[PDB]
Structure formats: C-alpha cells, structure tokens
Write a structure and sequence with these properties.
- This is part of a larger assembly, with nine protein chains of nine kinds.
- Chain A is mostly loops.
- Chain A has no helix or strand.
- Chain D is α+β, with helices and mostly antiparallel strands and 136 residues long.
- Chains in contact: A-F, B-C, B-E, C-D, C-H, D-F, F-I, G-H, H-I.
- Strand 3 (33-39) of chain G pairs parallel with strand 4 of chain H, so a sheet runs across the interface.
- Bound molecules: potassium ion (8 copies), magnesium ion (10 copies) and zinc ion (ZN).
- Zinc ion binds at residues 20, 22-23, 25, 37-38, 40-41 of chain E.
- Residues 135, 139-140 of chain F line the site of one potassium ion.
- Chain D binds one RNA strand of 329 nucleotides through helix 1, helix 2, helix 3, strand 1 and strand 2.
- Chain G: GO terms for molecular function: structural constituent of ribosome.
- Chain G: Keywords: Ribonucleoprotein, Ribosomal protein.
- Chain G: Belongs to the eukaryotic ribosomal protein eS28 family.
Chain lengths: 43, 102, 141, 136, 55, 142, 61, 194, 74
RNA sequence: AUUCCGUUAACGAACGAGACCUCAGCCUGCUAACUAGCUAUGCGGAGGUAUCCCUUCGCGGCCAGCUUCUUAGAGGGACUACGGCCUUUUAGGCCGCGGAAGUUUGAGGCAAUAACAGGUCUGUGAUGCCCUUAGAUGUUCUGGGCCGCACGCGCGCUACACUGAUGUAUUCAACGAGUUUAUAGCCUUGGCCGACAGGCCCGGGUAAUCUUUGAAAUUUCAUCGUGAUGGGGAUAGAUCAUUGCAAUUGUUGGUCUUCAACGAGGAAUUCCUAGUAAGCGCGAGUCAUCAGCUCGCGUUGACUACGUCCCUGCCCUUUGUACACACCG
C-alpha cells in the first residue's frame, strides 16, 4: 500500500475486512520528542 | 379593447427613475387614461464588505460597498397600442422599462 | 358616519395601533381581552393608562389593538402608548377640549412616554469589535 | 365565551383532558419511547404529553388554518445544546406532528386546506368553544 | 499528456474550479451576485461596477 | 405515604454495583455502567415501576423485573436503535451490555484493533487522540 | 455625629480628582463653617453626616 | 398628609411612608408625592445627566442592581419577580410596610465615611473623607444586593428569601446583615486611616 | 465542610414535629422546611402540599420558582 | 477643533477642521399603492338571549372608502429658537419650559503637509534585475503533508449551577439570501414514509407576489434539592443516514452507552459612559459537505462617572542639551 513515499507490506487477515487499506499503511512516522529548542519558552 | 398594462421601471438613479415615472404618468393622463401608481417597492441594497488591504498586514479595516436598486410599478387601463406609443417617449440611460399584461 | 380614531404607539421596532370607536367599553388586543396580556408581570404597564383615568372614562369606547414587531416588553409599551393616544384623540375629536386637556395632563403628569415615543434605537456595530462600542481584546505579547 | 377569552394554559389542560376522555385517539405504540425532538435530552415527563400536544396543536390550527408539519416542527422546536459549541435553533420531531394531525382529522377536528396545510372544521370550532365555555 | 490522464481530475467544485474573471487568481473570490471577482480586483473595479461607499 | 416504611433500604446491590436508596429509581438505576437516563426511563416504563418512588421504597421483585427488562430489551419491544451494542461484531445480535460486560466488549474491540495493526488501534496503544482532533495545543496531561 | 449643609463647592481634589473639596455650614450651629473632602457626586444644598467635625480638610495633591 | 391612589404592585401603599434621614432624603424616591409607580419597571432614561438617577424609584434601583453578573444581565422581569416575592416575604415576616422596610434598610446600610487612596509611586497611603448622600445610597443598594446574592449562591435558600432576610436585618442595626457588617468595616478602616 | 444529610422520606418523629410546629411558622417555604426539619426540597414540597390539603396553612402567593405559605390562623 | 472673539509688523490667501454625503430618530401635512395595509359593508362557521342583537374567525367587492398602520419620493422640522444666571456691551458656557430631538440630535463615510527602507513580487497578462527553462523552479496525474505532539503563548467557545438543569405549556424581531429546469441544479411551502437522521411525491418563487404563517434569552406550571448532583460535556465504543469521484488521520449530522478537569481562577492584563456594557439568538462571507471566525441584524437590558493628569500617551508654550542614525541618542 503506497503511503506517499513507500509501499508498506501487509498480509490480509480475516479481521481486517470492511476496513480501508489506508488504516494499515501509516502515512506519518510516530513522533518521539527531543529536547525543546531555542524559543520554546519565554513567550 | 381595455387591459391592465403593467409597467416595471428599474434604475440605480432615483432622479432619473422619478423623472421617467412622472413623464409616463403625465403622458397617460394626457390621453384620459386611468393610471394607478407609481408603486415604489422597498429599495434593494446590494451590500459587499471587503477588507481594504490587499494583504494580511495592518489593522483589519473593511470597506462597505452598497449598490441600491430602485423599482417602480405603474398600471394603465388602456390598449397595447396606446401604451406602446406612450412608452415610445425618450428614456434616459440607466432606466430599464418592462411592459407586460397582468 | 362612523365615530372612530386610530392611534399608533411605538417602542424600538414595536408598532401598536389602537382603533377606538363608540362602544360599551371593551378593550381587546388581537381579539384577546387586555386582562390576559402576557407577560403577567407587565400587566401593570399595560393597564397604567387605565388605572390612572378609571374605567368609567373607557366605559363608552370600544378599543381594538393590533401589534407587530419588537419584543415582549416593547409590544406592551407600544400597546399602552397607543391606548393613551387613541383615548386622547377620541376625546379631542368627539368630547370637550376641556376633558381632553384634563386627561392629557393627568397622563403626562404620571409618565410622558404614555404619549411621546422613545427615540432610542440600536446602534450599528463597527468592525473591529463584537458590539457598537466593545472592541476585540488587545494583546501585546 | 371562546378560546381567545380563556388562558391558553387552562384551555390546553381542559382540552387535553377532554381528548383523553373522548377515547377516539389512537396513540402510536412508540409514544413512550421517543423524545419530542432531536434537540431534547429526555422523553416528556408527563405521561399525557401526547394528549397535551394534540390539544395545543388543535388550538394552533383553530387560531390559524394554514399550518403544516414543518410549521409545527418549527413551532415546537427550540435551542439545541452542542456541548462546547454555541446553541442554535433546531426543529422538533415531524412524525409526532404528522400522527397528531392525522388523528385530529380522523376525529374531524381539522381537514385539509385547499391552499395546503390543515384547517379547523365547524365541528372543531364548536368543540373547542364548548370546552372553553365549560372551563369556568 | 495522455487524454485520459492530462487534466483528467474532476473540477466540478471547490476553489480550483473557480477563478477571478479579471486576474484569474483562485483566492478570495467574491461569488455574491455572480461577480466572480477576487477581493482585490473587486476593490479596484467597484466604482466602475457601480458600488458606492456611503458608510 | 410521606413517612418512610420499615422496609426502606438505604443501599442496594445490583450487578455488584452500589445503588443509592435515597435517589429516585430512574436516576438511581443510572449508577450501573451501560445504563443512562434514557434507558433507565424506558426500563422503568416497561417494568411498570412507578417513577415517583425512591430506590429504597420499591421491592426486590421490582428490581428483578427491572433487571430482566434490561437483559431482554427485545422481549419488551425496545427498538434496536435504542441499544448500546447494535449489530455485534462476532455474534451479530442487538443487546444492552452493562456492568463488566461493557468493559469486556470495549477491551475486545481495542485488542482487535491493535492486533491487526489498525491505525485507530495504534493510536489507542500510543495513548493519542483517535478522532482526528488536533494535539499541538490541547490534551496536554503528560 | 453632626449634620452639615454644603454652601458651595470649591472643586475637585486628589491626584485623580477623586474627591471634591467643599465648604459646609453646620445645621446645629449656623455660624460655624468647615472645610471637608467628599467622595462621590455632591452639589450645593446637600447634607453630609460628619462623624467628627474637628479635622480641617486640606488639598490631597 | 398626601394621598396617592397609585399602589406598588397594586398591593402596597406609598402613604404613611416617610424618609427619616435628612442627609439622604432628597436622593430616595419612595414617597407618595415623589412620583409613585405601579411597578419598578419603567424603562426610563436616568443616565442622561448628573444626579438624574436620584429620581428613579428606590425599588427600581434595587431591581436594577439585582441583575449583576453576566448570566443575569438584562433579566429585568426575573429581577422584578424576585423583588415582588421578597417584598411579600418581608410583609409576612415583619407586618410593616415593605417600602418602609426597604427605605430603613438603605438608610442603615449607607456608609457615611470612607478612606481614599492618596499619593502615588507605589505608596500605600489613605486619608479619611466624607461620602456624599447619593454615593451613600448607591453603596447601600450595592451592599444589600451583594449580600443577598452571596447568601443565595450555592444554597437551597431562594434569592427572594435571602433578599428579604437581608432587608429585614438591615432595616435595624442587627449586625447580622452582610451590608451592615461591610459598612461597619469601611467605617472602621476610615477611622483607622484618618 | 460536612455534607447535609437531608432525608427524602419522613420519620415518625420528624413527621410529628412537622404537624406540630409547622402550622405555627410565620413563613413557610420549601427551603425553610428543609433547613428546619432537615428534609430534602421534594419532601418539603410534599409536606407543604399535605399541610395545605389539611387546611392548617394558607397560600400567600404561589409561583413556579417561589411558594409562600403561612399559618392559617394567628 | 489653528473654532471663533480679539491683540497685533502684518495684510491677504490655500489645505486640514467645519460645511458635505449615508443611515436612524418626528410629520394623523403632500403624491401614490390587488407585489402593503386599515375601516365598514355582503355572505358563511362557532359561541352567547341563538333569527333581529353582541363577541371572534374565514372569503369576495380593480365601481365601497381611505392611507393611521407598511413602502418610497418631494418637502417641513432644530437655529441653542425662547427665559434666568456667569462671561470683556464679544466670542461663548450652565440650568430651565416647550419640543421627536438642546452632548456637533446619535452613528458613520470622506479626511491635510511630511514620513516608515512598516506589509504585500503568494491578487494582478503590474514590474526591473538575478535564477531556472525539457531528466524544468513550466504544466498535469497518483499518493502523502500543510492537522503530525514531552512543551510555551494569543483571539475565542463551553462551564463551575437553584438569579439554576430538565420536561411541558405559552408567543414577540431586524439586516438579508435564493434556480441552467434538463424528470432536476438555488430558497424551499404542502402531503406521505421514519424515532431521529433522512427519503419519496405534488408544486411556489429570477421575488414587498413564493421560502417568509418566518428565533433564543425570556414568561408560565411541574420534577430535581446543595450531593461534582438530573451542573459540566472532554474522552471513548457500537451503530445509522447525507455531501462528495474518494470520508481512513473519525468531513459533517443522528440513537444508545462512557461521564475527565472544572466548586469562580496568582502575579498581571483587555473593552466599555445608554438602547451603551453584558446576555440571547438570527442573516451573509467562506460553502459539493463543514463556523467555536469575520461582517451585519435585531431581542431583553444594567451598575458607575460625567472628573483628573496619579499611570500610559497626545497637542501647544517656556526652558536645558555635548542628541540630529535624533534617549532604543
Ligand atoms: K496533546
Ligand atoms: K439559591
Ligand atoms: K519580480
Ligand atoms: K486573490
Ligand atoms: K497624564
Ligand atoms: K492642543
Ligand atoms: K543645563
Ligand atoms: K535646540
Ligand atoms: Mg450509568
Ligand atoms: Mg401613512
Ligand atoms: Mg522591510
Ligand atoms: Mg495551516
Ligand atoms: Mg481578532
Ligand atoms: Mg412572530
Ligand atoms: Mg453529572
Ligand atoms: Mg447537563
Ligand atoms: Mg491598556
Ligand atoms: Mg478564517
Ligand atoms: Zn482578481
């Protein structure tokens, strides 16, 4: 399934019927937060 | 050979519209015809409010633009030929004339 | 020839018209007796022109009141103003000017709004704020 | 003495009682399960809500003879709460109004107006006037 | 491009289906009364169109 | 009738849930998970329980009637659209699940979503909003 | 606790003009006049209840 | 004596009511001679000129003050109903004229002296100053209404009962009234900061 | 603070106290009864209705948001 | 008000201000209304003594009359006109009767000289220069993103409840907007189906002709009873409809169910002087579908002051300067 950059590989299971193919190919990388940069506070 | 001829006058200029209405009324009266009106409908005020700036900077100031349309209704109890002859009189620009029956 | 007058009271956008003619002394608004006018709290304002003058002066006139526009309070204020003006005009045009002046004086001594419309009107709102004078909250940082 | 000369609340109560006593009304099986409109949070508190609504609607048709299902939905609608969003006007259930109108027509209190909507019949005027007179 | 591909995306609605009749820009289009003019163009041509500033 | 009877019971147990006896029946039955005000109203109406009585005035038999009404909505003509578990994923039946059954169903749905690596299941696992709400500014707790 | 009637208003007083300096003549003694500072609107002919009449008012600014 | 046919709510009389305070007599409109009204709703224009609001009926001023806080703004019919119920309760409890009770409450609530901020540049200095009769009446009304609202908030007791109790306890210097306590506190502060 | 433990149903002692002293109150309202007898507002309203039916009290003026009742006889 | 009275090496002038124009406020005076109404009559229904009489509704009269109510053109009206005080016999000011109106009647539009390296090249087939110009920084198609969430800030919506929530009954606005007719496109009346969401069928309106017979707060009667409670509605599950070619990262809208913080908010800080603040809703812009936003509208309707330069700033004059990139010197 194309996610805008790559074709994520999946195998269809009986429990995924009636669902969209988009639901199994995440289009974004989950966010892991680094230390805040300059300008995050003192606003 | 008598019918209720409906005359609708539409213009943006109140002076020109009123002058045309008065001319039509006097022309109808000169022919001993029965004249009902003019009936002045509520003025139609087309309003547009747009931001003055061509961009998003500065205090949000708005320009209120209005276009006023004035409508008049005149009813004549006479024949098509006579109403046509009356309406043949010169009409200044900006005034729209519509003649119908009922 | 019919003996009648028609007088209008105003308050904001509320317009009330009282048709007062010769009769046995009934008073109805939109076909409903004035005693059932709503809200019940404003019945005092509705009846003030009647309480000040007495029912005897109204005993010889039938009044039909038609109201439109405005809100609950404005309609009642227009109703009372129209009632007062209609009674004054009827007394002027069918009753001695002395009695007309007396009723006008008693009404005005209690309240001038019973015969003079309040000219207050809603102020147009200006851009840059929610209200006519209220402006959007200002922030500097 | 007519309807216009009596308090609307007392007349509504009296006419609802009269309609219930008549026994000609055929309440739908769902009267005890539905709200009076999508804007409501709970079903009507009073078990006689159907009869009260029928009486109020009959009075409305008696006063004006050109009302329809949409008109009654607007009449009995009101503000709808949207949680954290501001309130807006909302219409009421149309099925209840349609069924009440059909029942009233069956009882002959109202009939179809040629211009559309419903109109009060002579029998309906007579019945409402007698109820108003007997209120005293 | 291929006929079935080139400009094949439907444009029956949305901002991309409308443009200013004066400048062709697709933004800030005034559709009231059928003007179909962007706000800047309308502000420029209001006097010619017949829109007067009274207040 | 204004005087409390000797059989008035202050605290009641229904599906292992404490029900206040001082509260009216309609709003006291709502203490059970899966039962709201609307469903309590309909259960009381179908069970013929007088709504003006308190949760302590009525009888254990009336409580049992309320519970059977809750457990068999179809038998009492309660429409399908009024139930909180309509068209079940596995059984495909319509019922009103309450108490621990509601928690079991919620867990089953969440685990089913997570197992297939569904986007909603992943959002639930990560503890983020699952209904498209913006998260830049709101929902800040940890 | 005495009562005094304002005879004339000298005028606004305070950094922001909050008070008004006035001259008040005592009702009990009509030949005694005292200077007072008043908070709130006040005009000639008003009557003020002085809890104590010993102090003399001075300009606050 | 002056006799007026006008009845407040068609139930109460403006006869036999007299203001017993020369200081604030001219700024209270609760007498049969000073334009009595049937209801505290008249929709007049009292802010046009200085001191004009003094002509407004005192009951009307109480009703207007009762509409504080955003949720109650503009709900004058409800305020008038609250005033009517409070006046009825006052009559029931005290057997006197409720208008007289209100007048006495205002008179006893009005503070006589205050402390005004003096100086500048972050200096906390105060000087004792007198209070004009109009400001005294305004403060009396504000304190009575604030006490009634505070008592009614988060309490089964209804606003009408709270207002009636406040007016009854203010008509006499019982010291149980919130307005009386606030007036005493203000006077104490002024005495301290003389 | 401590929550008020108002009772939704009368006990024999409280009911007797209501029947005894309530007729002698100058002002009777649901709030007054709730504060004095320590009863809920609903029970206070029911007690007011019961007393009115018994005729021991009279209605000074009734409103949806306010009910004012007093002793029938001085 | 650099508005005037005057003083005067100044005299005459030109911009700004004012005048001006738009809306609102008064006209029982003028003109005209079957695309707006009123009055009385004729007929009919209902009620009351049921014929005649009284009350209330429905329909016709282009030869029943009329313009108070509605609409919109021309005009009138206020000029501080009049009375009392203060002020230079001035310019003017305060109060007051009358008056629709006595703050410039209220609110707006328009708005001088000289400037900012303030914003806009992402409004423009406005534009110089620079870059690219076919494996394109042109154009189009597919998909994704602009919305991504340990965190900080701004404008806001909903609340913390009984001056209340819920359920009945009750009934008062204004500014506005609406179609290609194709089976039909936009506003949609009426009838039927349905609990709702929605669906089907007759039709009206290119519009004072139809939607429009057109809101909420509020009023009234009951339930609730100080309990984070029948306050609050965040979060989440199941399921059903509509728009769209496409709804998943829920487009939006319904039913049941779950029922978070929040018990009035520190330092700080915003707007506001009368139909104003605040509350309440409605129309339009965006719009195939989405308004917690903006622009307008009306409804209920206040407290306080009508004073000052204390803070923050502005105008004029005098005065000091080692400032002129002008004290962020
Ligand atoms: K977050
Ligand atoms: K309370
Ligand atoms: K360029
Ligand atoms: K543009
Ligand atoms: K200053
Ligand atoms: K200046
Ligand atoms: K120096
Ligand atoms: K210099
Ligand atoms: Mg529950
Ligand atoms: Mg006219
Ligand atoms: Mg720059
Ligand atoms: Mg963005
Ligand atoms: Mg803003
Ligand atoms: Mg209406
Ligand atoms: Mg709760
Ligand atoms: Mg709630
Ligand atoms: Mg500031
Ligand atoms: Mg926007
Ligand atoms: Zn353009």
């Amino acid at each position: 399934i194309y996610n805008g950059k790559t074709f994520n590989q999946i195998e269809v299971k009986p429990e995924m019927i009636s669902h969209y193919l988009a639901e199994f190919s995440i289009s974004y990388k989950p966010v892991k937060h680094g230390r805040p940069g300059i300008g995050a506070t003192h606003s | 050979q008598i019918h209720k001829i409906r005359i609708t006058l539409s213009s943006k200029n109140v002076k020109n519209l009123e002058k045309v209405c008065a001319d039509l009324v006097r022309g109808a009266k000169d022919k001993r015809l029965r004249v009902k009106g003019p009936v002045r409908m509520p003025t139609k005020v087309l309003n547009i409010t747009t931001r003055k700036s061509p961009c998003g900077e500065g205090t949000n100031t708005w320009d209120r633009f209005e276009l006023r349309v004035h409508k008049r209704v005149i009813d004549l109890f006479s024949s098509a030929d006579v109403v046509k002859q009356i309406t043949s009189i010169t009409i200044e620009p900006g005034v729209e004339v519509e003649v119908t029956i009922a | 020839a019919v003996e009648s007058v028609q007088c209008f009271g105003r308050k904001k956008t509320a317009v009330a018209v009282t048709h007062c003619k010769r009769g046995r002394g009934l008073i109805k608004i939109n076909g409903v007796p004035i005693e059932l006018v709503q809200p019940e709290i404003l019945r005092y304002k509705a009846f003030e022109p009647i309480l000040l003058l007495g029912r005897h002066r109204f005993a010889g006139v039938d009044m039909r009141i038609r109201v439109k526009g405005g809100g609950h309070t404005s309609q009642i204020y227009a109703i009372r103003q129209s009632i007062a003006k209609a009674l004054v005009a009827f007394y002027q045009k069918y009753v001695d000017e002395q009695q007309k002046k007396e009723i006008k004086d008693i009404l005005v001594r209690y309240d001038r709004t019973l015969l003079v419309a309040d000219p207050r009107r809603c102020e147009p709102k200006k851009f840059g704020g929610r209200g006519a004078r209220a402006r959007f909250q200002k922030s500097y940082r | 003495r007519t309807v216009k000369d009596v308090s609307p609340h007392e007349f509504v109560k009296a006419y609802a009682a009269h309609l219930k006593r008549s026994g000609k009304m055929e309440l739908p099986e769902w009267t005890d399960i539905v709200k009076t409109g999508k804007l409501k949070e709970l079903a009507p508190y009073d078990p006689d809500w159907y009869y009260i609504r029928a009486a109020s609607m009959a009075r409305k048709i008696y006063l004006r003879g050109g009302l329809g299902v949409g008109g009654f939905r607007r009449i009995y609608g009101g503000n709808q709460r949207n949680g954290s969003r501001p309130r807006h006007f909302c219409k009421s259930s149309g099925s209840v109004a349609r069924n009440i109108l059909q029942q009233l027509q069956n009882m002959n209190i109202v009939d179809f107006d040629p211009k559309g909507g419903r109109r009060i019949t002579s029998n309906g005027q007579r019945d409402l006037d007698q109820v108003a007179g007997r209120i005293a | 491009g291929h006929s079935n591909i080139w400009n094949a995306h439907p444009k029956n609605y949305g901002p991309g289906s409308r443009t200013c009749r004066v400048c062709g820009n697709p933004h800030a289009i005034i559709r009231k009364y059928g003007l179909m003019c962007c706000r800047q163009c309308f502000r420029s041509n209001a006097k010619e169109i017949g829109f007067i500033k009274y207040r | 009738s204004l005087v409390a009877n000797e059989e008035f019971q202050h605290i009641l147990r229904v599906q292992n849930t404490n029900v206040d006896g001082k509260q009216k029946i309609m709003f006291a039955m709502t203490s059970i998970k899966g039962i709201g005000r609307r469903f309590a109203n309909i259960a009381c109406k179908k069970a013929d329980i007088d709504m003006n009585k308190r949760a302590g005035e009525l009888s254990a038999a009336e409580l049992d009637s309320l519970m059977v009404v809750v457990a068999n909505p179809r038998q009492f003509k309660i429409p399908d659209w009024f139930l909180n578990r309509q068209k079940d994923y596995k059984d495909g039946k319509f019922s009103q699940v309450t108490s621990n059954a509601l928690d079991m169903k919620l867990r089953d749905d969440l685990e089913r979503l997570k197992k297939i690596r569904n986007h909603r299941g992943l959002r639930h696992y990560w503890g983020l909003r699952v209904r498209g709400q913006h998260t830049k500014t709101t929902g800040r707790r940890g | 606790t005495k009562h005094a009637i304002v005879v004339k208003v000298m005028g606004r007083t305070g950094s922001r003009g909050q008070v008004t300096q006035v001259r008040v003549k005592f009702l009990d003694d009509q030949n005694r006049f005292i200077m007072r500072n008043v908070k709130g609107p006040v005009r000639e002919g008003d009557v003020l209840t002085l809890l104590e009449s010993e102090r003399e008012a001075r300009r606050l600014r | 004596k002056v006799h007026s046919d006008v009845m407040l709510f068609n139930r109460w009389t403006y006869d036999d009511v007299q203001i017993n305070d020369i200081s604030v007599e001219d700024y209270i409109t609760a007498t049969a001679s000073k334009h009595p009204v049937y209801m505290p709703h008249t929709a007049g224009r009292y802010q046009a000129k200085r001191f004009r609001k003094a002509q407004c009926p005192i009951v009307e001023r109480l009703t207007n003050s009762l509409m504080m806080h955003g949720r109650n703004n503009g709900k004058k019919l409800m305020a008038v109903r609250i005033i009517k119920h409070a006046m009825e309760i006052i009559h029931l409890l005290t057997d006197q004229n409720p208008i007289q009770v209100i007048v006495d409450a205002v008179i006893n609530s009005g503070p006589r002296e205050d402390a005004t901020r003096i100086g500048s540049a972050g200096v906390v200095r105060r000087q004792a100053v007198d209070i004009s009769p109009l400001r005294r009446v305004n403060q009396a009304i504000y304190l009575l209404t604030t006490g009634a609202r505070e008592s009614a908030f988060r309490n089964i007791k209804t606003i009408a009962e709270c207002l009636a109790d406040e007016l009854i306890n203010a008509a006499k210097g019982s010291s149980n009234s919130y307005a009386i306590k606030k007036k005493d506190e203000i006077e104490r502060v002024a005495k301290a900061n003389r | 603070k401590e929550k008020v433990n108002n009772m939704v149903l009368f006990d024999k002692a409280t009911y007797d106290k209501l029947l005894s002293e309530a007729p002698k109150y100058k002002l009777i309202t649901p709030s007054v009864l709730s504060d004095r007898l320590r009863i809920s507002g609903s029970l206070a309203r029911k007690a007011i209705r019961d007393l009115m039916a018994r005729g021991s009290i009279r209605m000074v003026s009734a409103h949806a948001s306010q009910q004012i009742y007093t002793r029938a006889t001085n």
